[PDB]
Amino acid sequence: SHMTAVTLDGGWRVRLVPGQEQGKTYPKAAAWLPAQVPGAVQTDLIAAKIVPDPFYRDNEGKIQWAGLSDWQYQTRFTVDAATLKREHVELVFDGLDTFAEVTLNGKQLLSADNMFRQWRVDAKSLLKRGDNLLEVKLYSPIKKIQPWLAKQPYALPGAYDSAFGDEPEARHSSTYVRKAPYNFGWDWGPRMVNAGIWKDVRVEAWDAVRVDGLHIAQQRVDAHSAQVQAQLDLQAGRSGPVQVTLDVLGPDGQKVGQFTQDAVVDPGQNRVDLAVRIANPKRWFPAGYGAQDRYTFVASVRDADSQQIKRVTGLRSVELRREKDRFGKSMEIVINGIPIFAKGANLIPLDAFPARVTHERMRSTLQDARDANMNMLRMWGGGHYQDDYFYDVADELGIMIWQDFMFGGAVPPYDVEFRENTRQEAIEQVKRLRDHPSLVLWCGNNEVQTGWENWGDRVKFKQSVDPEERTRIERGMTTLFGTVFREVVATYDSDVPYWATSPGTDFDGAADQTNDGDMHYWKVWGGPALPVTEYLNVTPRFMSAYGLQSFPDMRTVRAFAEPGDMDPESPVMRVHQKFDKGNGNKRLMLYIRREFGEPKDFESFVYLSQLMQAEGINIAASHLRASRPQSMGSLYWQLNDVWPGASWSSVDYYGRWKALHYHARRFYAPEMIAALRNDKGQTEVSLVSDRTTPLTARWRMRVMGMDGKVLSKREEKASVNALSSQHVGNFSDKQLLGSADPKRTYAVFELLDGDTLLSREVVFFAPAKQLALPAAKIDSQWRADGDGYALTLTSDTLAREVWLSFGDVDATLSDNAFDLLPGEPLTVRVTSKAALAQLQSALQVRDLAATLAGAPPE
């Protein structure tokens, strides 16, 4: 009949290839173990209790040997009556990580060398009735490449040194292998050089025609119409007639149209195209700009006996607008003719072990983005291309994906074999992902050009080789990221833009400029470690990375640590800090101390760390939105985590929100007031509106003594054009304070519609550690709210950065890390299965002033 597929994900065992030193050291791993597919031998070893959980305390080093070893997977499967007589029977590996040799009933069947490629092999003649034996050998990429690398004239500038000394300094095998770069350890992740059959394996069988894919190519989309072309790829083993029927369903569920096309297919590849025009399309818009409407395209193929394939897709135009203006050349994402200031963050993998990521976690990550008012995530090139399901959720929720190809910043080799291996990966990933409306941009890599131009080790490298070799290496990069990826996108996903490298100017000129293209800014946190107010002096056309570190939630810390470890410079805490080769808690202390002095205890440390991060990023993100149209994007580093540890994330490994993620919802709000005080004692006030209509609204400013008294009060009408930022005042300290003590005085700025409160920013005139913050009495009052509750908070005085917690009880909050103002109640919604009485007793309430009180000197 039609094609069939059977998944070979069960019955798998695994062990060390016989003869390795690791087999003597780990004899249990020399014998067969149950193996997960999809999975990793690493997680297989963990499940079998041969090694302890590498995420817990200091166990990271105990599993490093597995990445240095060669592995042998085995399974047995049966092929039945019907299957063996089909005209085609193929084995299909969706993911082999990475250097793989596949054997079927003892005969060599496939060599593989790309974690991101799908491998399809003709199996029919080698199969048999009943028991078949499938074997997959996986070779350590470190062990494989290093002996070859040791013999080379030079090693290309790579990624991170091994903390375990199993690779030479500045001689990294990772740049020579198409494998997720973060597997080799990063500056927020452990070194887990995974080996695995990390995606599904199938037996597939078919007769006359195989349906190789469906793509809805959008040719032009506007409000009047969408002209699309449904493109069907068909493999035929012989020449014959086919009949294709295409059904098109609206977002409402209605029936838009039915379309048919007859064709004769010929042996090999065949393309059958059906044009569809939709009048007055219900287009797909990013979050905050309308509905995430989508159409469904269902095609059937009758050959000489039918077959079904379905594509859900969203109609929209995408333009990367780069227009000359007074700040140079712009960079802005334009969806359905709407210029969208990009609001979001950088997305890294969801786990050190990618095969074990649940749908729930993928969905949760995106819903977190959504709830924090983000409209774009950048999928950073040091990770892996995501699961289909992840992209489904981004389509549904309206989170735009800026999709890096998976180059993380190492300098690639220029040999043809590497290039062509990478091309086929690119083609496969672009074909896989192209029909997701959320995928609006493709980007060749993370930071390769800017590293080559600005990082000391690249600069030293490129000047130490002969200039003729430098040209070869640069020609390699230019071709890979300027031609190969660009052409794959142009061929297979032609309606979306391509970008050579982030950050860059698409190879027009140099990387990382402030008046053209995008920028990653790291002079704050990294490098000279400048004060966070320096963020106010940087304004590129698009900021695609910047950030600050903080510790995860308390619950998360207890999850990888035990009381003996509860110190910023404990061995276990050090292991969980990956920045600045293990001594990055000093950098964190630097920033914490500047604003808050010395934390009283480890609890306050975690909190202050999250405040330092949250308040720092608020400065930058607000500054950038306020600068429109000078800037048109803010993607902070980073959204998420791979493991329990310190990082730049706003949401930790267990989905727990940091203070940053709650602040993010505010500074990314559709209507926002920015009031940002610079180091010159100048406070600039702007009203920002992402609305497509005019905003008629008022704003007010109030100057307050911390003793509770009002000093001055101003209010004005405001008319803000659509999609703009309007500067509405610029106030020196003298103007705001008069002779009032800066250490005892603050300012409140609010934006209102009618008198519904849209946004608020509270301004201070000194580092918090120098303030005379009042001691707040905060009043709790609960109330049923259906399945959840309403918690109302009232403070007699200013309370800064109020943090609500419930110990180990499970409850999430509509808001947290907020300011309370004198006599002004704030109600949050508490979601929890726990009863009112238990949330009563569990509730802990922390604030800045109470936290700073009783603190030691520095």
Ligand X SMILES: OC[C@H]1O[C@@H](O)[C@@H](O)[C@@H](O)[C@@H]1O
Contact residues for ligand X, defined by CB under 6 A: 186-188, 382, 409, 446-447, 520, 545, 637, 648
Minimum CB distance to a copy of itself smaller for 242 or for 626 = 242
Confirm or reject binding of residue 280 to a copy of itself (CB under 8 A). Answer: no
Tell me if residue 806 falls in helix, strand or coil. coil
Cis peptide before 638 (omega within 30 of 0): yes
Examine residue 98 and say whether the peptide bond preceding it is cis (omega within 30 degrees of 0): yes
**What tokens were used for 318?**
């995408």
Binding of a copy of itself at residue 648 (CB under 8 A)? Answer: no
Report residue 116 as tokens. Answer: 């991101």
CB-nearer residue toward a copy of itself: 94 or 469: 469
Q: Give how far Cα 794 sits from Cα of 247, 565, 664, 797, Å.
A: 57, 36, 23, 9
Element containing residue 310 per DSSP (H, E)? strand 308-313
Give me the half-sphere count of Cα atoms (radius 13 Å) on the Cβ side of residue 87.
12
**Owner of token pair 């999850």:** 559
Nearest-angstrom CA–CA distance, 546 and 787:
39
- We find the least distance from the C-beta atom of residue 616 to ligand X, in angstroms, to be 14
Let me know: does 180 contact 98? Beta carbons within 8 Å.
no
In the complex, the smallest distance separating the C-beta of residue 184 from ligand X, rounded to whole angstroms, is 12
If binding is defined by CB under 8 A, does position 152 make contact with a copy of itself? no
Number of Cβ within 10 Å of residue 104's Cβ equals 19
Task: Single out the residue of 272, 301, 573, 830 in contact with a copy of itself (rule: CB under 8 A).
Answer: 272
- Tell me, what DSSP letter sits at residue 127? -
- For ligand X, which is the closer residue by CB, 288 or 409? 409
Give the chain's end-to-end CA distance (angstroms, integer): 77
Minimal CA–CA distance to 405: which of 372, 371, 378? 378
Residue 495 Cβ vs a copy of itself, minimum distance, rounded to whole Å: 13
Residue nearest to ligand X (CB): 545
Question: 486 vs 663, which CB is nearer to a copy of itself?
Answer: 486
> To the nearest whole angstrom, how small is the minimum distance from the Cβ of residue 441 to a copy of itself?
17
Distance of CA 207 to the CA centre of its chain: 41
Question: What one-character DSSP code corresponds to residue 386?
Answer: P
**And the tokens for 421?**
């291996």
Going 450 to 455 to 457 to 460, the CA torsion angle's sign is positive
Tell me the window of 474-482, 627-635, 647-655, 792-800 that interacts with a copy of itself (CB under 8 A). 474-482
- Contact region with a copy of itself (CB under 8 A), list: 242-250, 502-510, 526-534, 847-855: 502-510
The entry of a copy of itself, ligand X, none that residue 187 binds, CB within 5 to 8 Å by partner kind: ligand X
| Interactions with a copy of itself, residue window 165-224 (CB under 8 A) | 219-220, 222, 224
DSSP H or E stretch at residue 620:
helix 602-626
Residue pair 510/448 in contact by the 8 Å Cβ criterion: no
The listed partner (a copy of itself, ligand X, none) that binds 349, CB under 5 to 8 Å by sort, is none
**How do strand 633-636 and strand 88-93 relate by DSSP bridges?**
unpaired
* Residue 729 interacting entry, from a copy of itself, ligand X, none, C-beta within 5 to 8 Å by type: none
Tell me how many helices (H) and strands (E) the chain has: 20, 44
DSSP 3-state helix, strand, coil percentages of the chain (rounded to 5)? 25, 35, 40
Q: Which is nearer to a copy of itself, 211 or 697 (CB)?
A: 211
Position among 4, 83, 367, 478 found at the interface with a copy of itself (CB under 8 A)? 478
Among residues 24, 62, 85, 277, the one that binds a copy of itself under rule CB under 8 A: 277
Residues in the chain that come right before a backbone break, where C and next N are over 2.5 Å apart? 304
Which of ligand X, a copy of itself, none lies near 186, with the C-beta cut-off 5 to 8 A by kind?
Answer: ligand X
Tokens of 676: 């940002």
Least gap, CB of 438 to ligand X (angstroms): 22
CA pair distance 212, 569, nearest whole angstrom: 55
Q: Does 564 bind a copy of itself (CB under 8 A)?
A: no
Choose, by CB under 8 A, the member of 78, 111, 152, 239 that binds a copy of itself.
239
Q: How far is the CB of 404 from a copy of itself (least distance, A)?
A: 19
> Which does residue 471 bind out of ligand X, a copy of itself, none, counting CB within 5 to 8 angstroms by kind?
a copy of itself
| Minimum distance, C-beta of residue 637 to ligand X, in the bound complex (Å) | 5
Q: Is residue 321 close enough to count as binding a copy of itself by CB under 8 A? A: no
Q: How far is the CB of 177 from ligand X (least distance, A)?
A: 18
Of residues 179 and 431, the one with the C-beta less far from a copy of itself: 431
Kindly tell me which residue out of 467, 527, 528, 563 binds a copy of itself, with binding defined by CB under 8 A.
467
Q: Where are the beta strands (DSSP E) in 513-662?
A: 519-520, 543-545, 633-636
Kindly state whether residue 483 participates in binding a copy of itself, applying the rule CB under 8 A: yes
> Quick check: 264 binds a copy of itself (CB under 8 A)?
yes
Judged by CB under 8 A, the residue of 200, 487, 598, 733 near a copy of itself is 487
How many Å apart are CA 532 and CA 426, to the nearest integer?
Answer: 38
Residue 269 found at the interface with a copy of itself (CB under 8 A)? yes
Contacts (CB under 8 A) with a copy of itself, residues 395-434 = 416
Q: Is the dihedral of CA 170, 175, 179, 182 positive or negative?
A: positive
Residue 264 interacting entry, from ligand X, a copy of itself, none, C-beta within 5 to 8 Å by type? a copy of itself
Tell me which of 378, 486, 520, 623 binds a copy of itself, using CB under 8 A: 486
Rounded Cα–Cα distance for residues 543 and 6 (Å): 46
Question: Is the Cβ–Cβ distance between 477 and 441 less than 8 Å?
Answer: no
Helix (H) or strand (E) holding 664: helix 659-667
Name which position in 471, 583, 730, 732 contacts a copy of itself (CB under 8 A).
Answer: 471
Would you count residue 128 as binding a copy of itself (CB under 8 A)? Answer: no
DSSP-based three-state secondary structure for 34: strand
Residue 474 binds a copy of itself, judged by CB under 8 A: yes
> Can residue 465 be called a binding residue for a copy of itself (CB under 8 A)?
no
Does position 367 bind a copy of itself by CB under 8 A?
A: no
Instruction: Check residue 85 for interaction with a copy of itself (CB under 8 A).
Output: no
Q: Given the complex with ligand X, which of 191 and 800 has the nearer CB atom?
A: 191
Task: Please choose which of ligand X, a copy of itself, none residue 739 contacts, taking the beta carbon within 5 to 8 angstroms, the exact cut-off set by kind.
Answer: none
Q: Is 709 in the site for a copy of itself (CB under 8 A)?
A: no
Q: 664 near 648, Cβ under 8 Å?
A: no
Shortest distance in whole angstroms from residue 450 CB to ligand X:
9
Q: Which residue lies nearer to ligand X by CB, 637 or 749?
A: 637
Instruction: Name the minimum Å distance from CB 462 to ligand X.
Output: 19
Which of ligand X, a copy of itself, none lies near 764, with the C-beta cut-off 5 to 8 A by kind?
none
Q: Which residues of 450-486 are buried (b: 16+ CB within 10 A; e: fewer)?
A: bbbeeeeebeebbeeeeeeeeeebeebbeebbbebbb
Residue 577 backbone phi and psi in degrees, to 5: -115, 110
State in angstroms the smallest separation of the CB of 217 from a copy of itself: 10
Q: Of these partners, a copy of itself, ligand X, none, which one is at the site of residue 637 (CB under 5 to 8 Å by kind)?
A: ligand X
CA nearest to 602, candidates 565, 556, 548: 565
Q: C-beta of 226: minimal distance to a copy of itself in Å?
A: 10
Q: Residue 275: which of a copy of itself, ligand X, none does it interact with, CB under 5 to 8 A by kind?
A: a copy of itself
Q: Quick one: which H or E segment has residue 394? A: helix 388-397
Residue 681 as a binder of a copy of itself (CB under 8 A): the answer is: no
Asked whether 430 and 442 are in contact (CB, 8 A), the reply is yes
Question: Is 593 among the residues that bind a copy of itself (CB under 8 A)?
Answer: no
Q: Cα–Cα distance between 802 and 81 in angstroms, integer?
A: 68
Burial of 822 (0-12, 13-18, 19+ CB in 10 A): middle
Binding site for a copy of itself (CB under 8 A): 219-220, 222, 224-225, 227, 229, 239, 261, 263-264, 266-273, 275, 277, 416, 463, 467, 470-472, 474-475, 478-479, 482-483, 486-487, 490-491, 507-509
